[PDB]
Amino acid sequence: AVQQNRKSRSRRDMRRSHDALTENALTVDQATGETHRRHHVTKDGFYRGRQLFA
Amino acid sequence: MIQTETMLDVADNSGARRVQCIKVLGGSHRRYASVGDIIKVTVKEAIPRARVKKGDVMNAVVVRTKFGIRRPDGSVIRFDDNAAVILNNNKAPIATRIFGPVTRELRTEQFMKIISLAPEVL
Amino acid sequence: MRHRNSGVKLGRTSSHRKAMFQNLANSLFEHELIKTTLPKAKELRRVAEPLITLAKNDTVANRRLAFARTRNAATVGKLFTVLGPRYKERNGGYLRVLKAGFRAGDAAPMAYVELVDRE
Amino acid sequence: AIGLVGRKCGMTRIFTDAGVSVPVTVIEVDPNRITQIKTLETDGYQAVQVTTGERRESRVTNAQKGHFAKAGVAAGRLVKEFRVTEAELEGREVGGTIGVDLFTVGQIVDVTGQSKGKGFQGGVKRWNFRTQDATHGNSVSHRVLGSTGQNQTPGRVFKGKKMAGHLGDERVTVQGLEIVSVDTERSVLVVKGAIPGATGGDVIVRPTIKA
Amino acid sequence: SGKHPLVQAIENSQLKTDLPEFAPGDTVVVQVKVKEGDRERLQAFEGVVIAKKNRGLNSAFTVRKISSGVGVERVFQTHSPVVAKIEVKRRGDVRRAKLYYLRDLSGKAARIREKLP
RNA sequence: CAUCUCAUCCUGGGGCUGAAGCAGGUCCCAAGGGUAUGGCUGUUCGCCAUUUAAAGAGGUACGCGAGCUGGGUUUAGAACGUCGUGAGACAGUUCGGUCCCUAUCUACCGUGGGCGCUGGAAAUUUGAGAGGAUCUGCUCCUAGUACGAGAGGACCAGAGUGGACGAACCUCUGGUGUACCGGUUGUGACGCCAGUCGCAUCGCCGGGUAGCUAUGUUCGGAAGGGAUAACCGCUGAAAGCAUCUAAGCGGGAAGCCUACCUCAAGAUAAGAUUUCCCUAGGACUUUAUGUCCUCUAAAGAGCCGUUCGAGACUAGGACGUUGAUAGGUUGGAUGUGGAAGCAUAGUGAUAUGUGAAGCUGACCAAUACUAAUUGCUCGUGAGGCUUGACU
RNA sequence: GGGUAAGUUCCGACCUGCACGAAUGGCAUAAUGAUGGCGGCGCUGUCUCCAGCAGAGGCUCAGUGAAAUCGAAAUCGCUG
RNA sequence: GUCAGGUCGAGUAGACCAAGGCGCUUGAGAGAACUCUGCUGAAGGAACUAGGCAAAAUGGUACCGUAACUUCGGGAGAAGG
RNA sequence: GGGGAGUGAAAUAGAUCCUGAAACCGCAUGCAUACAAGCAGUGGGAGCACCUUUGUGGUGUGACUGCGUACCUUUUGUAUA
Ligand SMILES: [Mg+2]
Ligand SMILES: [Mg+2]
Ligand SMILES: [Mg+2]
Ligand SMILES: [Mg+2]
Ligand SMILES: [Mg+2]
Ligand SMILES: [Mg+2]
Ligand SMILES: [Mg+2]
Ligand SMILES: [Mg+2]
Ligand SMILES: [Mg+2]
Ligand SMILES: [Mg+2]
Ligand SMILES: [Mg+2]
Ligand SMILES: [Mg+2]
Ligand SMILES: [Mg+2]
Ligand SMILES: [Mg+2]
Ligand SMILES: [Mg+2]
Ligand SMILES: [Mg+2]
Ligand SMILES: [Mg+2]
Ligand SMILES: [Mg+2]
Ligand SMILES: [Mg+2]
Ligand SMILES: [Mg+2]
Ligand SMILES: [Mg+2]
Ligand SMILES: [Mg+2]
Ligand SMILES: [Mg+2]
Ligand SMILES: [Mg+2]
Ligand SMILES: [Mg+2]
Ligand SMILES: [Mg+2]
Ligand SMILES: [Mg+2]
Ligand SMILES: [Mg+2]
Ligand SMILES: [Mg+2]
Ligand SMILES: [Mg+2]
Ligand SMILES: [Mg+2]
Ligand SMILES: [Mg+2]
Ligand SMILES: [Mg+2]
Ligand SMILES: [Mg+2]
Ligand SMILES: [Mg+2]
Ligand SMILES: [Mg+2]
Ligand SMILES: [Mg+2]
Ligand SMILES: [Mg+2]
Ligand SMILES: [Mg+2]
């Protein structure tokens, strides 16, 4: 139910050794020149040579 | 699929009407009996003046079940009730009249009298 | 286990799920471009393309089927006058699902759903 | 024991002249191509390496491309070895082909496949554990494990204890199955009974080890 | 069918090519080969068709009769050589595909209205 | 839910017998596997009924309540017998009476990340080692023979068919199948008739495709090799004989090691085989697998996307336009069982024809219609030294 | 003695009442009781022996964010 | 404490609606073991258990029919159709 | 919320504003650390890094190795579970 001894600050940092974040897949849409998330519509509505909500 | 506490009809005319299974014979921890399997029964209902009386403990052979009987081609045969036939201590049938149909699984040499006296053998 | 099974649950009862997908189909047929979540968008194809396939033949039984399945008279009128004749010579694939980032208050993956030859 | 690699195509029945129905599994064999022969002098043991199927050349690496081009054969979808002897390594050469005619009707075989995966499963399914009372005061303990040990002697759980975990998805061999039909024009084997895995998975057929 | 074309090609090689058409609700007589070792004969099973299954080679149909006061159901496999011959005697007029309710009726209450053309 | 011992209940191997045979008694060797369900009582036990090859004896906090229960005992209520003047009490009996904890560390069952493995990569592997499994009945046959006055009734050897346990699988037989088809009650709506939606446990009722399943279907525990236990020897002295032992040579068990299935090189001793990739320039001094600046970025792996009979998250399998990976579309199959509209017959409920119609999740086959992109990151530039063999 | 194949409980008797007994009442008694014991019919996932499905959690992602405990920890097995 | 409509109904019970009022101040996915709340289940039918605990079952209106025993009221909606 | 500018002797005296300790929590540099079993020190002792001198000097780290079961209380007697 509960610990008998407190955890050292070393064993607490050893558990967090898998807690790191990674980056996303970002590409340059040289149809428009901007940076965008791969396979996603850009911030203003562009994708692979088409524009939504002109 | 007969097991302990199952009630069965009597298909012969030895004097019993309802019998109850109290032991499936032939093996340690054996669960079910099907057509052709010996069974230990107690007599719950009998006819006034016959050789078997209410409360006796006898051997019997199961001849009809609701669960069914598989055949080599993949077919089943079901019946509308469960029935048995009373036997001796020698394991020989003891009646002179069978009632109802019967399957071919009883074409052994110790059960050929039921086949002979049966109205219909499937 | 889930071997070879189709359909979603999406945290709802069966009847709520049916009602929500019917509502989505009606909204799509009206506006022709909507924004939803990606798991809701990918299951909407399986609900909304059969209605367009059905509206390609304009009979009374077909229109009564479309009304039993949409319960919206404006949608039935738009399917058998506009949307059906537009895709009469297209063999399936009348929608388009496009990933569109994440929701602010939720961090939920979103998508655009649009009709193919709109505007 | 030299055998065949095939694909499980489905399960069927065959009626015989005497009316008996025989449950059968169909195995499709695209004829196997010999890609390598390992011998005592360069390997330490005798084996025949075999490929079957087809792969598109954009999914074959340059190393596997060179290995397949060293023989004559085309790239298949998998590669597998069979331990053999000589008098079994008799006429086998690279660029050879093993077909369904390696077997005959009435032969006994073993078929190894990869069984279906059931995921993370409990004690009742994985080890045929018995359940506890359903309604006689039982609180929240129906399909749970029960006891896992003793009391301070030995003071630990023993190794190999039966618990919950992953079930299925292993290599399983079924021995003692009979060949029912060897169709040469469709390149198919039909065997009697059930074989491990799903439809479409890779199976290996080889003569029985018991005999 | 819903099977791979290879299993279907293997199954087609052993279909009975001329079976009489019948539906659930009809009464049929089936002739079944029985063989007690050396001897071979045919036994008749006459009764009402209760169910039917359409799966090519995996077809089957269930027949129900009353023999000596006890009800019997057999589930014949259609394309099995044990079934020598089927003949339809009387056609019935029913409104569903499975007549399992007839299991809990007997006598005048289990009668089937004959289909007349 | 177990785990161990052997002082062994069954099965296996033997010596003696007041051992004719079958069956027993007793002792020795043997721990591989196996080793009932019920009636009564809170019972452990015990008695009884019916089975079985058999229903072993014990240790493990009289194994096991941070795994469950709470019938007995041993709080508070109440009563009987008995004891006490009484408050109360018991070699007693009787009816009723709250079972808390989200798991930190060790252990255990699964599943990943890192680095190592003498340049890097993609596969295919060897097996030091580990785990699993290991049970048994009845019939036939030899043969109604050997043995026995008879009644009875074999060893050795072979053939079949069961029980219990386990695995895999879904063709068959069934269950389930709240995104499939139909019948029907109440009420509200869609303007109304007709039609058909919401809600009432999926309202209720009858069916049922895939998948998953057991009660369904197949298969397994076969045969062999080696060293042994008790026991039986051959030859043979010490001890002219005798003697299985001292020298020498043998037979011998469900036990041991192999043999069958599965895992396995983090086996840090980190093994092997096939194939693939990398061959530019300048300075420079802490002078050595030394550093710095331009040039370069391979084989491959991953991110991402479409997804899966793979899955908690992972990992693993397939595909990404030179494409059938998923959805849709078209054909088929299946289930349900005679759609809507119209026409006819009938006073009407309704029935018939058009027409086995209409609809039909997850199935099979085709088909680029929709989505799998223009990409980015990582991974380098020939791989120290010393010896010995071949050149 | 009865009931069950089998009944330490139940019902009927016997009287050998360890230690019943007549208003701290004795022996019965129709009706009534969420009262104690025992036996039947029906019905059943209580069970043999569990399978499938539905919703809420569990699990993953985003936001907020406790608890009891705690000498310090570089916190393995067996035999003593 | 007061008011309290419609269809069916004996009803202020109950299902669905009116007028009126709300979707209850974390969501999105996935669809493992196990836990909770449900639904269906072959053949058997209390073998479960201290104990049929829990579930399953019965259920309306009219008419026919109803035992011992009794304090003469009952029992009795006995039972059963 | 901060960065410049400006005030002031002083702004890590800027309003949570004199001084500003410890427990606790970061970022940077050096060395050690992924085949090895336990009160974490102590006695030895190689290597590396930085200062310095021409060191038998200084500072940090510590491969490998002998020995080694916390403190208080109460007790005949405590690593004591
Ligand atoms: Mg730190
Ligand atoms: Mg799928
Ligand atoms: Mg949710
Ligand atoms: Mg509903
Ligand atoms: Mg899976
Ligand atoms: Mg509780
Ligand atoms: Mg519960
Ligand atoms: Mg210990
Ligand atoms: Mg011994
Ligand atoms: Mg007992
Ligand atoms: Mg009883
Ligand atoms: Mg104990
Ligand atoms: Mg108690
Ligand atoms: Mg008291
Ligand atoms: Mg099936
Ligand atoms: Mg099914
Ligand atoms: Mg109407
Ligand atoms: Mg409502
Ligand atoms: Mg289609
Ligand atoms: Mg309809
Ligand atoms: Mg009892
Ligand atoms: Mg008294
Ligand atoms: Mg008195
Ligand atoms: Mg009262
Ligand atoms: Mg969170
Ligand atoms: Mg049932
Ligand atoms: Mg049933
Ligand atoms: Mg009982
Ligand atoms: Mg019991
Ligand atoms: Mg109850
Ligand atoms: Mg209920
Ligand atoms: Mg300062
Ligand atoms: Mg200050
Ligand atoms: Mg090291
Ligand atoms: Mg340690
Ligand atoms: Mg003390
Ligand atoms: Mg003391
Ligand atoms: Mg000491
Ligand atoms: Mg301790």
Half-sphere exposure (Cβ direction) of D55: Cα atoms closer than 13 Å: 17
Residue with tokens 């074959």: D60
Ligand 24: centre distance to CA E58 (Å): 68
Residue with tokens 């399983």: D172
d(CA E82, CA E62): 15
Domain that holds residue C49: 13-115
Count of CB atoms within 10 A of residue C85's CB? 13
* Residue D80 neighbours by CB under 8 Å, 6+ apart: D5, D49, D50, D51, D204
Are the beta carbons of B84 and B8 closer than 8 angstroms?
A: yes
Q: How far apart are the first and last CA of chain B?
A: 19
CA distances from D130 to B29, D83, D125, D164, D167 (A): 16, 43, 10, 14, 18
The number of domains in chain A is 1
Cβ-in-10-Å burial (0-12, 13-18, 19+) of B10 comes to buried
d(CA B61, CA B37): 6
* Residue E89 neighbours by CB under 8 Å, 6+ apart: E26, E27, E28, E29, E46
Domain that holds residue A49: 1-54
Are the beta carbons of D9 and D203 closer than 8 angstroms?
A: no
* Residue B6 neighbours by CB under 8 Å, 6+ apart: B20, B21, B82
Are the beta carbons of C21 and C43 closer than 8 angstroms?
A: yes
Domain for residue C4, yes or no? Answer: no
Q: Who surrounds ion ligand 2 at CB < 5 A?
A: C 4
Task: Give me the A residues in range 1-54 that sit within 7 A (CB) of strand F.
Answer: 1-4, 7, 11, 18, 24-25, 27-31, 36, 38-40, 48
**From the CA of A6, how many Å to the C1' of I18?**
39
d(CA D147, CA C90): 65
* Residue C89 neighbours by CB under 8 Å, 6+ apart: none
**Chain C residue with the nearest C-alpha to that of D117:** C1
The technique is: cryo-EM
- Contact list, A47 vs chain C (CB under 8 Å): 98
**From the CA of D165, how many Å to the C1' of H50?**
37
Residue type, D81: E
**From the CA of C81, how many Å to the C1' of I19?**
86
d(CA C106, CA C101): 12
Domain for residue C32, yes or no? Answer: yes
The number of domains in chain B is 1
- Of B98, B35, B104, B99, the C-alpha closest to B64 is B35
Neighbours of chain A (3+ CB pairs under 8 A): C
| Two structure tokens written together for C103 | 């929701």
Strand H contact at CB of residue D167, distance < 7 A? no
Query: Do B74 and D19 lie within an 8 Å CB cutoff?
Result: no
| Two structure tokens written together for D1 | 């024991």
**From the CA of D163, how many Å to the C1' of F37?**
30
Strand G proximity list, CB < 7 Å: A 1-8, 10-11; B 3-4, 20, 22-23, 31, 42, 44, 55, 57; C 1, 9, 11-14, 106-107; D 124-125, 130-131, 133-136, 154-156
CA distances from C59 to A11, C80, C94 (A): 73, 9, 21
d(CA C45, CA C42): 6
According to DSSP, the β-strands at D78-83 and D47-52 are antiparallel
- Contact list, B74 vs chain D (CB under 8 Å): 13, 21
Ligand 21: centre distance to CA D133 (Å): 20
d(CA D72, CA C15): 61
d(CA D63, CA D188): 32
The nucleotide lying nearest C14 (C-alpha to C1') is: F178
- Contact list, A27 vs chain C (CB under 8 Å): none
Domain that holds residue B89: 1-122
Closest ligand to C-alpha of residue C61 is 20
Domain for residue C5, yes or no? Answer: no
3-state SS of chain B is: CECCCCEEEECECCCEEEEEEEEECCCCCCCCECCCCEEEEEEEEECCCCCCCCCCEEEEEEEECCCCEECCCCCEEEECCCEEEEECCCCCECCCCECCEECHHHCCCCCHHHHHHCCEEC
B64 alpha carbon, distance to own chain's centre: 7
d(CA E21, CA E80): 16
| Two structure tokens written together for B22 | 């109290």
d(CA E62, CA E100): 10
What radius of gyration, in Å, describes the C-alpha atoms of chain D? 23
Are the beta carbons of E27 and E47 closer than 8 angstroms?
A: yes
The number of domains in chain C is 1
Residue with tokens 């279909």: E15
Give the experimental resolution in Å: 2.7
Size of interface D-E (CB pairs under 8 A): 38
d(CA D120, CA C1): 10
Domain for residue C6, yes or no? Answer: no
Length of chain C: 119
Count of CB atoms within 10 A of residue E47's CB? 19
